[model samples]
Target: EKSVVFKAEGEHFTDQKGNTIVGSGSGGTTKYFRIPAMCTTSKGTIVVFADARHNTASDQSFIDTAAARSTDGGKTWNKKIAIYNDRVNSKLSRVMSPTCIVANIQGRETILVMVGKWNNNDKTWGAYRDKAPDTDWDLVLYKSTDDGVTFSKVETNIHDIVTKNGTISAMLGGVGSGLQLNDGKLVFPVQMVRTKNITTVLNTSFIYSTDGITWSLPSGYCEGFGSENNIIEFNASLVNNIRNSGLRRSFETKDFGKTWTEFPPMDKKVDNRNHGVQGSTITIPSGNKLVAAHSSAQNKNNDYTRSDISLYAHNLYSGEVKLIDDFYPKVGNASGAGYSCLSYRKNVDKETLYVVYEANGSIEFQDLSRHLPVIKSYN
Candidate 1:
């Protein structure tokens, strides 16, 4: 069983009202999500994510970029810095869901790539999705050159990679979580939406840049109608996995996104009818250990609810996919809260694993360690 790092506080924010804030829905209450961890220029590990009072409507849902640095380890985090300067309570400008990645490219200080969208846009300004601010909505990014202390918007529409074969016109949501491959190629994941037969669904695609400026969609890495696919460098290769039902399947690439294997379903334990979403993956310091954590929903014909499980894959290359830890541990009554993200922290002295997710609009944290016994007993 995994040890407790922090108990659920119901309201994780330190706002003045002290009102309880759940990590779900959209509004002007602090909701935490899209959490990813990476090392800063100072070699300290930094955890970054998107937080806002709410994510309701275009202007009604105000989202901004925020980050917290852990100097010691994954033990604690400092107050977050609201990095989005465009955040105003007005209807014309509303920051949307954002994701970040920290990389030390070209031997310079570590750079962080924050990507998200301003849902509703007009000729003058952009608003949330439902607001009438602009006609052409654009994907925006913020770059941090000096660790994560300060960040500035570097480029807009970074995911506008198109070919003469077709035009890429889908909007971006929940991307740029800093997926760096073994060959030093950095890739960002995005969900592309398009209408088919008067129905809308999100297709999963990615953009990669070797130098952090010019980006394009990776060849042979796209899958149809997908969302929340995560990439990790496993076995000296980049493995992009998708959360399909209960199982997390992946498309493997050995040449750093230049070429990729087929998108085969991972041979792990999955019962899709009972599982809510495909989980996220994180590579441990040992490099061989892979963790895929997701919310495990109890399947019922009448009424379905949400619960969760944190699964760890040991020596994934050798086919030793083990369920190392389940943060909530035991299955109980459902809370209708699931959905999670996995990250790891490597310090000079130690390497720590962190898992971030939401439960009924509450943020939950778990510290995963190698010292913990293997979860073979569960098998």
Candidate 2:
């Protein structure tokens, strides 16, 4: 009965209004915007966050957290703004992999952005290895009160909060946005890494908050080797979808992420591409079904390829997953659909789902409205 409508243009698969929100060659201070994290705020403002690769596209460089806000349901975006940027002396300060969460703290709407801070020059695998004195791959926080307009100063010291168990050496990275539980608790998905002599293990864990200021981790973590995950609550249980070895893994937690039970890896019908890439998931407002967006390339191996961008809808109650559509189908020689994030505009009609993803070396928007007709007819 209630759904957003999109303007159809011709017989093309892509939406005509689909335009690049952040371009790679549109240089100012940053060269590229990648690893997107998007969410619709309580005020219906759509905020998209990314890694501003300042000098180059390499993972290790002068990276900063950048954001762009769209007030008109992602039709147009404001100029990109650097939300977190600092200098640790001259050469060792950088922010990486921003994860955002929007919730109401007391009576005000708040946005919490989490990032991994590297303050030393050892930007190599050795830096993350176990040594007598552990290195600093710390997790930091930044808050925005007036939607995505402005942000507070970076909270550089989150190690105490996240490493309360005293076993976690560092937080490797975070992707997508946090999820709020039914009882008002905020849960953030992060890759928690523990270091031992000549060995390092990565686990998918939760950093939760009752209020926005204090955060704590669960007693134990999940058994998976993946990062850049998103969480959603379905029927009082927490469902986590993470990018694993070469496929996306699903895990469920009934006790607020204290422990998890793993499910079968999502097959090619759901992804059909290398699963070792960053993807995003969110619950659609109208149907409460799970919707995921990722590169749907049919590559044979676990390597990273961002070709065909696709969407999959999962019904938790029925345990049925269906491929809604592939936005950018990988045919012939087409490629370039990388990291993505999904946000549903509850206030909009018809095309309520908004996806901001990496395409053609730039951030592009695809209004997902193809399934709306089916949904409307069913309703």
Candidate 3:
């Protein structure tokens, strides 16, 4: 009797329609939505988040962070809910990019949502130049204690750390999810944008906290133009998959993301795609293999044509990648698949890997297990 149904294949679930979870015209206040991030709580609740573009689909307009919850493992989603909206004064503040994470904090399971905040009046670089020196951007945090049903009010701002340190102009955290390290520390990958002599530079870094209430930045940041980086833990270390202008690179940090060393760019055979876009990676429920979802478009010349969204499984020890499945095949003249986020849940029969991505101006969901019947045995 359900409106949507999924058929399990080898190691993935193939749902032809993709169960359009959030449609463009569905949200009353917004015309379209973009940038999807999802998380599965310990209590078995799945929450999906996106940018509800209240005006146009453009990223600079009146955008508010919104979410939808699914109690039944993404089979159906509740109506879209506005989680963060500072539109009371459209000129002063607006929220963009919802990055969510689930972790056990002080023996309680918590859902933390991190987002980028910008001035509504000046959504562009020129506006930052026209405004005050300290009027750049900041990061905002929201907490959910009731298993994704309700969230706490804007818990804290990254500016509290920025104002105290007085080094970087702005810090934007993950577009996917944060990680709770083996030592009980919470680490969020951040893109630090700094201005020098009227020019802006972006660096990949992370912020960490032991209690989840306070955060601190590392002593130094890696030199690169990493944006929308997502983190996963492997063998008590952190592995970051970063989007850096047509090259998806990997960095590893054994010291809790305080410092990193670059691994060879993710094998170009699978991940190479259009530059300046977002992708997501997560550890499978088995905790041995890692899976990533992103636009695997072959055409590098076309920067925005993010077609051929694909999924790949990686062997953490050998750095080997095996193509599991291509979710959206590139077709005739289809522009491209947009951004994506991944979350994983364990079931009795098998582990379900949930992929929520942008397609046809709405958010869609699919499970990758049907395509990957078994985790590759790397001897």
Candidate 4:
């Protein structure tokens, strides 16, 4: 009964007038979708969010947030809806890195999506970048209260919190899902250009909210040169998985989100020295063992390519990673398997594993019940 579904598609195509037109600014056009985030609520409502990049597939183009909902445990999906749109007001705005976190707020299931925006004076400057920018790259929020149905935009006071009043210009939300720890504290991973600096020293950092509403940034909480980030709870600790260009670096904080510590050398599989694709890591308890599920491109091409997407199972105690499955790549002009996210949700008496990934031109969803066959653990 498990299945695969198409969530959204790109509109980058040619017109009858022989003019290859694409969306620009905010409502122009596009033929690409990437950076997907997923969240399954307390009531079994599954929601997937991504950026609909207009114009060319380059990071310079403007983007709007695209979302879809599935009520039947991701068996099928509804139509794609535009949640956040970028407008050209004196500057061409771009919204990138749509990350989602699910929590029960005030007895109602709530989903909070965190994003980053930098309005360039024009479309010539790259918006989705990790370099230092001239203008302020502000953090934004969009929330849903009705089980991932409708979302409202909320402008967050973030630049001052993450930057200490505009010290560095590089900042963006991590292109994946956020973590809600066992103790109810919500953590959203983010990227920063730490002089930690002038050499474009991009690092992994985050802003957290103890009450799921008000958020703050603390000192020494950020670490590593991992540009994009993903988070999960491992061994009762918060582990930050960095998507570094060279190797996958994993940082841990035993005291919730208060501090960070690098993994010891004895733990071998924490750092993946392969293709630098953004990976999705989710940890679950199996019997008395803590198991982590990680998904990313397993191989690379000499011509600088992303292919061979696979799922890896990590044995926490032994520090080993084993390949569990290899998925078919939908290759085109883009990489075989691009950004991906893994999520596990409990629905009544049954639990299921799901993934939403970007393939060549569009976004794809698959039920991992068969691929992740051995996992039957939790809480």
Q: lDDT per residue, candidate 4, 1-379, as tens digits? A: 3233332243433333546434642344454677888988877777988776654455555666767789987767764544544455322456777888887655556798877765664543233243334454666788888888888875555654654534345666677788877667777887766432345456576777765557776565455465677777766667777775555777787775567887642123533334467778777666666678877764455222456556678766656667776553533245234678888876686677778877664677777867544643311
TM-score of 4: 0.83
Tell me, by lDDT, which candidate is best.
Answer: 4
Worst lDDT run of 10 residues, candidate 4, spans 124-133
Instruction: Give the runs in model 3 whose Cα sits over 4 Å from its true position.
Output: 1-29, 88-93, 125-136, 197-200, 265-270, 285-301, 330-337, 347-350, 376-379
Highest TM-score, which number? 4
lDDT of 1 at 345: 52
For model 3, the local distance difference test gives 0.63
TM-score of each: 0.70, 0.80, 0.82, 0.83
On residues 144-259, what C-alpha lDDT tens digit does candidate 2 reach at each position? Answer: 88888987755443577554566566774458777777788878887866656424466787787777677777776776455557777767777778776555777878887777
lDDT against true structure, model 2: 0.61
- Model 1 alpha-carbon miss at residue 34, Å: 6.4
Looking at model 3, residue 289 earns an lDDT score of: 51
Q: Model 3 shows how many backbone clashes?
A: 13
Candidate 1 deviant stretches above 4 angstroms = 1-42, 53-60, 81-94, 119-136, 156-166, 171-176, 195-201, 235-237, 254-275, 285-305, 329-336, 370-379
Residue 280 in model 3: lDDT: 80
lDDT, model 1, position 82: 44
Question: Poorest 10 consecutive residues of model 3 by lDDT?
Answer: 6-15
Ranking by lDDT: 4, 3, 2, 1
Return model 4's CA RMSD, one decimal: 5.1
